[PDB]
Design a protein around this ligand. Structure first.
Ligand SMILES: O=P(O)(O)OC[C@H]1O[C@@](CO)(OP(=O)(O)O)[C@@H](O)[C@@H]1O
Ligand SMILES: O=P(O)(O)OC[C@H]1O[C@@](CO)(OP(=O)(O)O)[C@@H](O)[C@@H]1O
Ligand SMILES: [Cl-]
Ligand SMILES: [Cl-]
Ligand SMILES: [K+]
Ligand SMILES: [K+]
Ligand SMILES: [K+]
Ligand SMILES: [K+]
Ligand SMILES: [Mg+2]
Ligand SMILES: [Mg+2]
Ligand SMILES: [Mg+2]
Ligand SMILES: [Mg+2]
Lengths: 498, 498, 498, 498
């Protein structure tokens, strides 16, 4: 039981040497320089996130170039993720550029674009034409990240709602609007997003973090916009509202990965419900073997302070115990004073959580929910992980060109590193969002085609020795195809390191 | 499995109607008035904590009096906890009330009280007279929640250490000092602690939160300071150093319960190890059926903001999922701007985590670890909980005078309230630290002996109806003695509400 | 696991002192005398079975009278069971009163009653009018307990089947016919059976063993034939063919109990399938908490030999491990040379099987398959058994007038005796088919009405002491109602024996 | 649970197509001809047992020769077992070839061979010269499968005991004698056993069934009598006395497998304890992955009847459900009237029990008991079985030369056949005692070395197709070494049949 496992935990024992979980860092003025990014990489960053909510293509090109240069210098493969602005609802403008409200204030809100630029205390504009179908009397409209909240008293005409102001607040021009619990019908890709996706495709980003995904259809529109040239870029869907949570099964099916985007989510749904969504969404991703990222305010106070609060430490540990492949930093690295320290703390917390995890509980739980019969590559990957537990293997080694087989092994949550020998550099970069995996690049143009695997296996076992995962005489579990089967791995071997 | 349970969670189901977990609030200037206490109680405070780190006896006397008046107005039993100063260490005062340090600012710290008032960038006072024994050259001194550290360059003399300041910090007055891994030989009951405890006994406090407990022996010292008249006051040992964690088993055996005192703990040991300690301590308490409180920085940001962070909500939810009876607030209610709201958030988060909990996993895990044969009262209480599950009982009802039988039922973690009819007001107040329990007072002096239990049972069934736990036709599981047995409950009944 | 439980078994340890399973013995010329029946009772017989396939009402009246006299002499309550002849299909007669067949012989079989008395090698009569709808070409007809088998080659007209003889055999007049795998539409109660049921009702038999039950409807016709005066007599349905197995759920629902009548069953279905039916039927009875008897050839060789074969010993042990309340002797006691010895061996084998049973596996398995919410009496009975395991109770004690609550406790398979204090002597007799139960009679006419239970509880605890189930200072789990609830037990107590 | 599995069983589903369990038949006059052996083999005999209790070397030489000729005609590998006489004890001969005893017939038994031929109601011979040491006055002497017992009234002299006959028995010639609980110091290898074993080695028998093994030391004695040329012959230790059961752990560790020799066992210990011993011994063998045979009186009545009893069918089914690799026939085939039919019933019953077995309960129970870390070959074999389950493989295929790897796969109890391609004919024959395994011989001298395994794998895949285990498109789980590793299998592949 979990309870029995807890009572036997020790704070004194040595922790795991090899960190399994992965860290996504948002780049900003604290961290954009090549030097700063090197240090972020040494501290534990695996994926650099560009938040296209702010900043021009020029700003972000600089992030791209610097990330590549810092990674080249250190000889790391660092993923690059483009996180979209996404669609939004916002208010219009206000007379004099601001207005203040008091509890009890009655205010009309209108979708009549006549009122767009002349917002007053009496009446102002929201740029969502379907507003009066989307929220009904007694429902709420949140303004400005949920900070001001309105209750809908009545619908006055097909374009106007009379509302009750719930708290003191001062609005300025074009604040954000949330319609918590309401279906919101907006394109998956704005016109800005297209330009932003086109840039990403041209600069060779490894993955998109797609904002405000509500339906599987929207995932497909994002994939369509990426086009032929972007067909290999991961789409990681951001679950940010009740629709995303409701539709999660088909959203997972259509995505490469999920981000539990807790910031907007905890505005769209009651904040205390974010823990339920988080647990559910992470476990649902674990079950199908797709990467999941937990995001937003994990180590927030380290934006200004050199150590984290007690709540923050438990937050990161618990994301890891819930099952998340990745955890994410936003403000903490984009603009905070302690970018390296916050990454270093995150890394250490991940390692403690990992070391406190019961080896085999995840493996068994995940395996017990798979449909039988499995595909043969999945039988091979799950049983390779089992056989790793049986021999206390110190590493596993898999050949994967697309990354598929690596993610399939990570799905079964071994307790050791998964060394992936790949022939694609973008695969190295993309596997950064997958728990346990460490990539080595095999250059087939330079070394030859390796139909019999032996060079790639050699390279992987050499890597394992070099990086101190295992040494001579240790068993390594090795997964690839035999000499004739193409397209997936049908073979597992236990090999002693020479 | 946990995983299978997780994937079934919904954010759209109704939540539990009756909150099982319990909230401890620290009283300060925000919260000491009768009016403010009433509102804390309305918001969900079950125990008021007085922090004897600060304030005179007169100040706390006002807290005691105000809590009793508030509670009597609302008709509630609110526990009162005296939290000791203990072996605390602090700076003196400073020139102007703050000094500012830069990394490498060589600084003299002195045990000599002549510098108490008059601290400066180059010399200040610390109130631990054996300082220059406890920490030698090369050692480190942690200042104000470990935010600033000083490496000891050298011993100037028996009263004075020359220190290297290691990082940027602006220092306020009387800040806390930790010396992790140092030989600190201070009493668990100082002279000042002894007077505090005697004050507590005189004023009839329900429980002690005993700071810095390191050994079972120290628990017994606190018990001896409480003396003959203090013998029924609970001793909740606060685990907040390395030794406390080492000695947790015997500390638990000696105490009536435990606090995971994460604030000091996360300076005394590395912060990232706190999550492991927490998990281990909470589960060890659950296994023996003793109350356990998770403390410190749970909703920290709500000291100044109207909403908590995503990490803070998670922290509360997970302490509950960990198995904690109680969660605690410190500065959030003592001195924050939103004391009522922070308690209300905590309550909502508790109920959410409670509703996300698998019914029977705790019951089974805890039961599977108990020595067979059990004592009859434990066989009775655990099988009463099992029957509650089998019939989907909406409440249980137990007669308990000491509180033992209520705590024995709560040990098996039913999913419904436990209505406890008790003959002692102090039992009502002390059972505030026990998950699920709701107390009703039966005045045996005023109402008679009740040998056949019928008066107390009726009082309990009527309470169940009034507080809307159950209605006519609902089955209730009722635990007390038959007509002969004295000293424990030997009987369970299922009873339809009349 | 079962496997782990096995590897820790010891042949050397002491076996259980109190035999839980029960033995049904068929009475015949070896065993009909009062003396013989006394010895059968001392050897371990709980239920005397009268096989109304043979013998007149006069013969059976003698069994009834002698059973009662022997039981009175010993002060035991012995159940009396009337086992019906039941409906049958048989051949007609043969010329010269016999005929011999050889493999390959072609024979017409007809339902034309013209041919009833003139059976030849060429053609003979079977008295089942629906024969040519019931078996199709390629199907089989078994004659004479399956000893000769015919293959149906073709249907010649609506009353005649041309058949192929499969083995050497000699038929005499009116042999038994089985149509294996065929639905057989015959009344549940023949005209003989009515007379036999009327006798049983008038002589006060405790239970019917109803032969050849195929459908729930037939159970109801047997209950109808027993009438008002027989409404309290148990109906134990004999599963003897494929329909019975197919319809087992609704047959269990309609019966009081089941007998796995393996003799006819292993004729009607392939003999190797009888083990599958047995396991299934027993487990299905365990799950609903109704008594099940395993019957036929269990110790067959002891009909002539003074000790059993190795197969026979495993047969009885395995019936007990499968979950059967009772095991049965037929020829072994009706006409065998070693009636006492065979009962004594059976008893010893039951005790070994019982002692090798994992205490709590059954309890948990059975409980995990009950629908929630349970009725309250069932919650009380299952949790009483749980609490017996928790305290290693040496006995339980239940007040039951109809036997219902006793059977409800036995359903959860405690490892100790269940002492039932009843107010009905027929309940004492009927509880003989229920595992673990030992009855004591409370004479309410003679001792008074005992609304507060205390006399019946006294009598039960005295009994427990007398019969050496427990002694002073041992815990006994005691189940009945509280002082107001009528019609079922809503209360459990743990009581120390004074 | 077992219970839940049971209630789901159906008698109407198709049964398994490939019988996993194995049948050992004893050869005698019924079965010694080439023709009769062919038919036994066709009926499902996998191992022929020669019982060296009886017959000369010439007689058994005929058995050996006839088995090889039968097997070669049918193209089968049939194991040949030599079952030793061992420390047997028997009566001499009698006046007329039988005497009859009555309870209380005082009778003299003598070690003096002068009475060997000429035994009578008042004096007869027993062939154990130390009789009057081994059993003293008050002791008991068990005669002919314990059917008759004699209490020793007194020691007449060193050669003679005066006995009280205790029950009715008619005594035939050379009947068996047991002296349970008596000090019997006879060799495990008598002089006569030594010549028998040497004969066996000369004639190339595949295995020894070693009677009356009591200690690991005795196993080592049998091994030493087999000498250098006999070192690869399996030693199956027969457990048939009290000490054998006591010492089962070390006896198992010393042997290649075990027989539960229920005939002698059930006289040496009380008969009802045999079921416990059986369960314990079989499971201990399963846990270490050594072959285990259940023996004696399984289908006893079929010695003279065409159909078995309900107990006998049950006995076979439960030995299989217990976990036994093999079940055995003695008199049933040696000297019975229906040798072919009794083997056919046994086969059908095996397949029925096999089909009633929960797929994966054995796999998990056995795996959960193994020491971690495993050897690589065991991690490979157990995870190969798990992948077979995951893909619903219709066969596995293993290369094994010694048989070790085939037995290691069979230890984890897959539900499909295990096709073993071996380079040793003797391995083919010895793997007949291992559940599931079907052997194909690869002649490396004739066909070449096969370093890359492709010849043997093809031979195995073609066999799978021919024997209808799988067809084109079916996945098969294939276990051998990769191209480098020698001495064990380190590799698993899933392969679609071409
Ligand atoms: O790129 P993914 O989809 O992970 O597939 C990789 C698997 O397919 C194979 C065989 O096709 O690749 P490869 O041809 O490069 O050797 C296996 O060796 C390898 O494990
Ligand atoms: O005869 P059953 O149906 O078992 O019911 C017996 C139960 O009902 C009660 C109460 O009605 O019987 P009783 O009235 O004889 O005392 C319980 O005490 C007793 O356990
Ligand atoms: Cl206007
Ligand atoms: Cl005729
Ligand atoms: K964004
Ligand atoms: K304090
Ligand atoms: K009958
Ligand atoms: K022998
Ligand atoms: Mg967002
Ligand atoms: Mg503290
Ligand atoms: Mg019958
Ligand atoms: Mg023998």
């Amino acid at each position: 039981s979990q309870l029995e496992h807890n009572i036997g935990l020790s704070i004194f024992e040595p922790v795991a040497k090899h960190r399994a979980n992965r860290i996504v860092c948002t780049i900003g003025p604290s961290t954009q320089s090549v030097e700063a990014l090197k240090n972020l990489m040494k501290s534990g960053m695996s994926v650099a996130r560009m938040n296209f909510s702010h900043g021009s293509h020029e700003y972000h090109q600089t992030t791209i170039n610097n990330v590549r240069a810092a990674a080249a210098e250190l000889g790391l493969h660092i993923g690059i993720a483009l996180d979209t602005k996404g669609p939004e609802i916002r208010t219009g403008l206000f007379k004099d550029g601001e207005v203040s409200f008091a509890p009890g204030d009655i205010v009309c809100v209108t979708t009549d674009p006549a009122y767009e630029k002349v917002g007053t205390k009496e009446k102002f504009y929201i740029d969502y034409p379907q507003l009066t179908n989307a929220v009904r009397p007694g429902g709420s409209i949140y303004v400005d990240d949920g900070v001001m909240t309105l209750r809908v008293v009545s619908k006055e005409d097909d374009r106007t709602l009379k509302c009750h102001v719930n708290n003191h607040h001062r609005l300025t021009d074009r604040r954000g609007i949330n319609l918590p619990g309401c279906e919101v019908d907006l394109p998956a890709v704005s016109e800005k997003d297209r330009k932003d996706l086109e840039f990403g495709v041209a600069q060779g980003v490894d993955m998109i973090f797609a904002s405000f995904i509500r339906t599987a259809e929207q995932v497909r529109e994002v994939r369509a916009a990426l086009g032929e040239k972007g067909k290999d870029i991961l789409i990681i869907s951001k679950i940010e509202n009740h629709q995303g949570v409701q539709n999660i099964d088909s959203i997972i099916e259509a995505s490469n990965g999920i981000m539990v985007a807790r910031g907007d989510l905890g505005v769209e749904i009651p904040a205390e419900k974010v823990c339920v969504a988080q647990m559910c969404i992470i476990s649902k991703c674990n079950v199908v073997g797709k990467p999941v990222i937990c995001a937003t305010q994990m180590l927030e106070s380290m934006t200004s302070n050199p150590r984290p609060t007690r709540a923050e430490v438990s937050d990161v540990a618990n994301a890891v115990l819930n099952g998340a492949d990745c955890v994410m930093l936003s403000g903490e690295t984009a603009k905070g004073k302690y970018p390296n320290e916050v990454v270093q703390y995150m890394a250490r917390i991940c390692v403690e959580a990992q070391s406190a995890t019961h080896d085999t509980v995840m493996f068994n739980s995940i395996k017990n929910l798979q449909k039988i019969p499995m595909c043969p590559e999945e039988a091979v990957c799950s049983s390779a992980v089992a056989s790793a537990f049986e021999v206390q293997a110190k590493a596993m080694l898999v050949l994967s060109n697309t990354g598929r087989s690596a993610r399939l092994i990570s799905k079964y949550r071994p307790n050791c590193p998964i060394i992936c020998v790949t022939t694609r550099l973008q695969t190295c970069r993309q596997l950064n969002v997958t728990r346990s995996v460490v990539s080595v690049f095999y250059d087939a143009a330079k070394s030859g085609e390796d139909k019999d695997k032996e060079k790639r296996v050699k390279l992987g076992l050499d890597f394992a020795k070099k990086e101190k995962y295992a040494s001579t005489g240790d068993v390594v579990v090795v997964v690839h195809a035999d000499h004739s089967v193409k397209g997936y791995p049908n073979q597992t071997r236990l090999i002693y390191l020479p």
